[PDB]
Every structure is written in structure tokens, then in C-alpha cells.
Amino acid sequence: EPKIHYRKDYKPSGFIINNVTLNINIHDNETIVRSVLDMDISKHNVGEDLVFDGVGLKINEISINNKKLVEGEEYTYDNEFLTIFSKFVPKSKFAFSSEVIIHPETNYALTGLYKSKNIIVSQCEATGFRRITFFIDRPDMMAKYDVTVTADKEKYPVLLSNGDKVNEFEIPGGRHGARFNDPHLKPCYLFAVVAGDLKHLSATYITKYTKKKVELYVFSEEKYVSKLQWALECLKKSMAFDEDYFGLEYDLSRLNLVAVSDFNVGAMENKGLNIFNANSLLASKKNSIDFSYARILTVVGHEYFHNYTGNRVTLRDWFQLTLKEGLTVHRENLFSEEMTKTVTTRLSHVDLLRSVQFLEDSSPLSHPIRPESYVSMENFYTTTVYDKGSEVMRMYLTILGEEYYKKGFDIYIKKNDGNTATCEDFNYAMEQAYKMKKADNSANLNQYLLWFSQSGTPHVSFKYNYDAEKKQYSIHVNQYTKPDENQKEKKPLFIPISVGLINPENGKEMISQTTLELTKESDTFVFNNIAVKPIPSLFRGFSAPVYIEDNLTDEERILLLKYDSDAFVRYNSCTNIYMKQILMNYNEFLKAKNEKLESFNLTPVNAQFIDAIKYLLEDPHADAGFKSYIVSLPQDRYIINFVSNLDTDVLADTKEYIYKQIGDKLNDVYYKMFKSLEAKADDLTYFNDESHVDFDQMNMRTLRNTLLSLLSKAQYPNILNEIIEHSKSPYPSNWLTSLSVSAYFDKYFELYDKTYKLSKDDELLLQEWLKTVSRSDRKDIYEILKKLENEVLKDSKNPNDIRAVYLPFTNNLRRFHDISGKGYKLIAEVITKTDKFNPMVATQLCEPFKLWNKLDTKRQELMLNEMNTMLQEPNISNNLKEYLLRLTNKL
Ligand SMILES: [NH3+][C@H]1CCc2c(Br)ccc(Br)c2CC1(O)O
Ligand SMILES: [Cl-]
Ligand SMILES: [Zn+2]
């Protein structure tokens, strides 16, 4: 029965905070925070008490207009809210001031002000500023910030906060201070401070239009300063992209990026002072796997793009979160697609959406991208809000085209720059462009708003007709969203369907690609002068976030896979072929299990599909990244969206059969390709250059490592020789793959020790090594996890360490879901232990339970018993309690 906030209840504050003047004085065993708030009474004031958020603060004194308030008589504080009785609240402009004590050195929850190794750092989104000092801690309370930080100079030579550094000064006793002025009004969740012995790389950027000089700095601890350069390159690329595509320039004289080792999320867009999980900022080619480079490009870009979509235009309230996150992910997706120029970039986003986000949207946690209520906002930084939000933001571009999309985006910025905004404000701007494109001032996007308010994944299904004498082709389309616990009645959405038509005789396009606008529950689209029966290429680029039911034969899907122009449709046609096979074999194994059959049949894999995989693999002009997708079955969390009461044992048996069906025909091709790809995949050009990344070459290594895994599982003759040579590669992607694939051989623990020694002296590489062990397909994985706990992880409270040890293992379909329930018990024990010092990470660790009600009856009960046991833990966090109550349909 928690405190629940509702979107419909929004109302402006009765107060105004115009300026914030902070003095943050860091000592070994306490930090003293002095704060002066220059305040006023708003037009919405009705004489209410003045209530500040303030969580876990120790009050030394509080004052109004430099007269101390008296506890009990004039205020009360209950460790969450400071209430000043209205009788003592002025009726015009006044100053509120306070001095509180906080303890970053024991703040293991990494919210508010905390210590990460030898760095002091803040994290204030969403509602952490109230853990530093008193505030009306909501994003519509925008103010200007004057921040002084003081500390021991030897321990903390670098002091940072938002904006211009206006003074530096020495203090008796070996201390010093620095003062910052941020001229841009901001909500308090964008405040940040950093103190540490930081080293940096720097550059000067000159903006495109106003020719402003901007100093760019990237910071880390001294040991890792050599890992800063790619992030700086990524920042320069991000700034140029926002200038080139959106015409947006940076608006301060300096921008700082800072890496810290202990961080709950990827990074944070604090104004002029972006703070990063080190794993999302630091890399070097000797000490990072390839995937670090796309991760840093993404996160550095994302944080930079927030400078407009989030900071200069911010949020009226937290229900609008997708307005900054969906939009900023979309901006980062456009950026990364342009930077990498690989079709796999878009494909990876689709692969993530249709696995983890579709799972979420059919789970008890399902919510629209603009939720209707919350208890802890930190539980709603979800793949729905971010990734479905991004697809909803991308649909605007698909509908409008680039020219009118840019026009609408510029309207959004112009109308809302410097202010809070709502999702409706964005839709309104897009609507102005829509009216232009349609040349119709009665056109509107009112229906489009359902994408913000309606939960659940739409299902879009197709039927076809071709009249050869008339040369007339028809596509009959239906949409359906399943009722859920948010709406028992669902409405049709505005679904853009990018389509082409392929001539199956020559593989050629038969129409100009066109985007069909489905706005009704069903529609028929007719095409004339279609000279022969086509195969339709549907939802090109994955043009709407939906379940696609193409009702094509496997023969037609093979032709698309081979000849279509659109990477997504080729990949999806392959996905659909696999799913048809998976569901068939799954049912065959399931019946044999349920009926305790002594003999039964399995349906073999389609031989023409196997031939098509071989054809694409052997094509020297086809794309290595795309090839790695075609030889992999769909993700387990994708598959589960199509199976009721999923028995994970039967699914594992199903995958095993299909992979071996294909390998028994293609392993020699796999081996030949693994060998022929080596020269180009592993070429050492630019290995000593952190300013250039070859994303195509990286995709060649991904393909090689995918093929090696398939060949190792298959026990291909003498493949251990290749694994051992692979362990000698300079590329960590390769030598960590050699550990993974050696799980099937007696050399596993030899390579475990070899790669440990290669990893143990770099904090981030060791975490990648932990992930590799955790995900190893070992029969003794439970004993290996104990080894990691006892020898490596031990008592670490570092979120990266804990997540590395446990989350990859939870994707071990056969072992995590052991029918004894021991894997559920193991992870629940970790969740409960972690919740006592880091509620956010504890809730992140709950991820495997999200599919609990989609599993077979026995596993459902096992998972539910562990969740209810977690709910019984004394002093459970609000974060974890809310999450588990919602997930078990109690909230
Ligand atoms: N505002 C920050 C919130 C933290 C977070 C989370 Br949670 C998930 C993905 C990303 Br990317 C981020 C970075 C961010 O800038 O959105
Ligand atoms: Cl000063
Ligand atoms: Zn973000």
C-alpha cells in the first residue's frame, strides 16, 4: 500500500525557487552542505505549508531570511520531508537556507552524493538531489545554480560542477575550493559535482554556425587515462551530427565527461558535466572487447543529444520521461547508423526491442511509454520508455520524411527552448509539419497520441490477392492489440508500413518503395500494373513496433532472404522461417515428453533454407555482420513471445536439434569461412589508433566468433587447435571467445586461468572476463559461480562486478531454469543481499523473473515462491517492493 503518484494529478507548485547557492565541503568522515534558496510565492499558492524533500539529511540548522527556524514550533522533519508551517512562510520573496551533514563515504546506493573508489561524485536523476540538500525535488522547479566545492587538495585536486568556473582559491589546512556558475535554468536532477585526482584529455571544438570555441574534457582516474581517446572522438562526432542534421550547437564554453567505476546506470546528462559508468566511456583496443566501441559511441552520443532533448527542453513532470529518453535514443540511433554505416546497427536495436521490450509489454509490468502512475520513478527507466519510445519517435520521421521531420523538430525546439515540455508538445510540433506535408490544415495527429497512452504490442497481419489478367495486386491488412490490465479495450493505431514488391523471377523491385498508412482496424491496399505475382517486402526498416504476421510460405521467405533490398525484411524472413521450425519441433518434443512416448518423429529443417544460408555465407560480397544473424536462432526472449507455458527444457532440446540439423550440413562451410575470414578480420591496421574504428572489420570478427562457437559445440574435428590459436590473438573479442567456446573441451580451465591473467589488471576487462565465465556453457556452472564468488567477486559492492557475475548466467536456458529451482533461489538470494545496500541494482537483478507467468506450471510456481519470499524480507526497499508487487499483480 505505497505512496502512488498519478499523471492526471499534476499541478504546479505554490512556490518558486529562482536561485540555488551551494557550498559543498567534503571531509573524510562527513560532507557539510550549505544551501541558500532564493524563493518566491507562485500564483498557484493557497497559503500551504512549505514542504521540502530531504532524505537522510542531518540538520545542523535551517533558516528563513537569516533567522533560524525552531524545530517543533516552526518546522518538523521526519527524514523524508521538511515541513515549515505556513504561519512562518513569507508571503513574498524570501531566502531559505540550511546546513546539513551527509556521508558520501558510506553511500553504497550510489544515489545522491557518494564515493566511487577515490572519487566523490553525485547522481541526482530522478529524485536524488533531495539526498544532498533540501529541495522541491521535481523537474518543473527550474533555477540557476551557484556552486562552491571545497576539499583536501592532495586527495581532490580536480573539482567540478555545472557551468563556468568563476573562481579557484586556497583554504587553510591543505584545502582548496572552486566555484561554478551555470547560467541555464535547470531542474535539480541535472545538478552534478565531482571531486577527485582526475587526469584528462582535451580538445577545442569550434561550433559550425556561431564559431563558438568549446573546450572538451574527458576525465578518468590516472590508471586509465590512456583509455579516454575514443570517447573524445565520439563526442566530437556527436557535436557535428547535431549541427549537421538538426542545426543544433552547444551552448556553454566547456563540456566535461567523467568516468567513474561505481555507477548504477550507463551515464547521466548533467549540464556541462556528463558522468559515465566507466564501461560506457573507457576503452583501448588492447584491453576492451570490440563491443565497447559501439557502446561508447552510443552513450557519449546519447548524453550529448540530451543537451537539447532533456536539458534545454526539459520535462514538466516525470510521466513525460519518454519525451527526453525516447527522443534522445532516436537521435542516438540516427547518429550511430550514420557513423557505423552497417546494416547491423538497426538490426541490433530491432533484436533488442522484439526480445526484451516485447517481453515487457506482454508481462504484468506492461505500461504505455507515458505511464499513468508510479511509486519509485527509478523503476520506469524501462526498455518500453526508452526503446519503444524511440520507435514511436522514429515513426514520425518515417511518416513525414526527412524534410518535414526536420521542420517539425525545429518547431519543437523553437517553441519549447528553455522551458519544461510534455509529450503533447512534441506531437503538436510534428502535427504542424504533418499539415504542411499533407497540404491540409485539417490533418491532425490526434490518433498518433495513442502511441503514448496505449500499452501492448500491436499485431499486424496480412492476406494477399493477385489477379494475373488484371495485373492487380491486393494487400489486406489487419491490426489488433490484445487487451491487458491497462486498457480492456484497445484502439487502432496510426501504423506506417514501409513496403516494397519483389519480382520472384529476377529479384527486382516492382514499385517505388512506399509507406502505407494503416489507421483503421483493417484496410485493403490495391496496386495496379503489377506485371507478375510479387512477394511483398513488409515493414521495411522495421517501420512500426509491432508483431508482423507475413503469412508467407518458407519458399517466399527464402526468396526475400536472398534477393530483397531491405536488411530488416531479409532478417525477419529468416527469423520467421526459424520460428516456424522452432514451434513445430517444440511441439513434437513437448508431446513426446507429456505422453511419455517411447518413439516419435521430428520434422527436419527445410533443406532449401539450409541451401540459402550456405549461398549467403559463401557470397564474398555479402555482409559479414548480416551473416552472423542468419546462422543464429532467434533469441530465447523473442521465442517465448510465441509459446504458452514454455518448458525451457523442451525449448533447449528444440534449439539443440535445429542447430545440429544445420551444422550437420554446413559445418564444413563454417570452418572454411572461419579460416578464410582470418586475414581481414584480424588485420592489425589501426590497432594503435584510438581515433579510428572499422565497424565492418569488427563485424567480420563477430562472424568468426559466431562460427567458432557453432563449430566448438559441434565438436568439429580438431577445432580445439583453432581455439588454442585463437586464444593467442591480440584482440580481446577473440581471446575471450576462446574461453567461451572452450567450455566444450578439457582445456576450459587452462584458458580460464590464461584469460584471467590477461584480464585481472584492468578493471573493465576483468568485468568482461567475469561475463564470459558467467555465460559459459558449462555443466559445472553452479560450481564455477561459487569459484567466482570466493576468488574474484568476494564482497564487492561495485554494480558492474555483481551484474557481470550473475546476469549472463541467468540467460543459461538449460541451467538457470533447472527444474529444481536452484537458479531462481540463487538469484533471489543475490537480489535480497544487494537490496540492503543498492536497491536500484537489486531490482535490475530481478530481470529474469519478468517472464515468470509465461513459463510452464512448475517453473511459474517456483519463481513465484522466490518472489514472494523476497517480498517478505524485512526492510525491503521501496524499489524492490514496488517492482515485485507489480510483477506478481499485487500493484
Ligand atoms: N538520463 C540517464 C538515465 C540513465 C539511463 C538508463 Br536507466 C538507461 C539507459 C540510458 Br542510455 C541511461 C542514460 C540517461 O541519459 O538516459
Ligand atoms: Cl568564491
Ligand atoms: Zn537518456
UniProtKB/Swiss-Prot annotation:
Q: Where is this site: Cleavage?
A: 601-602
Does the record carry Transmembrane helix as a key word? no
Q: In the UniProt record, what gene is named as encoding this protein?
A: M1AAP
UniProt keyword annotations, A-Z = Aminopeptidase, Cytoplasm, Dipeptidase, Hydrolase, Membrane, Metal-binding, Metalloprotease, Nucleus, Protease, Signal, Vacuole, Zinc
Tell whether Oxidoreductase is among the UniProt keywords. Answer: no
Q: Which organism is it from?
A: Plasmodium falciparum (isolate 3D7)
The record gives the effect of mutating residue 265 to P as:
Severely affects substrate specificity. No effect on Zn(2+) binding
What are the site positions for Transition state stabilizer? 386
Q: What else is known?
A: May have an additional translation initiation. Translation initiation at the first Met codon would generate a form that contains the signal peptide, enters the endomembrane system, and ultimately reaches the food vacuole. Initiation of translation at an internal Met codon would result in a form that lacks the signal peptide, thereby re-directing the protein to the cytosol. A nuclear localization signal would then lead to nuclear import.
Active site per the UniProt annotation: 303
Needed cofactors, names only, are:
Zn(2+)
Can you list the GO cellular component terms from the UniProt entry?
A: cytoplasm; food vacuole; membrane; nucleus; symbiont-containing vacuole membrane; vacuolar lumen
This chain's protein is named: Aminopeptidase N
**What EC number(s) does this enzyme carry?**
3.4.11.-
Top EC class per UniProt? hydrolase
Its Gene Ontology biological processes? proteolysis
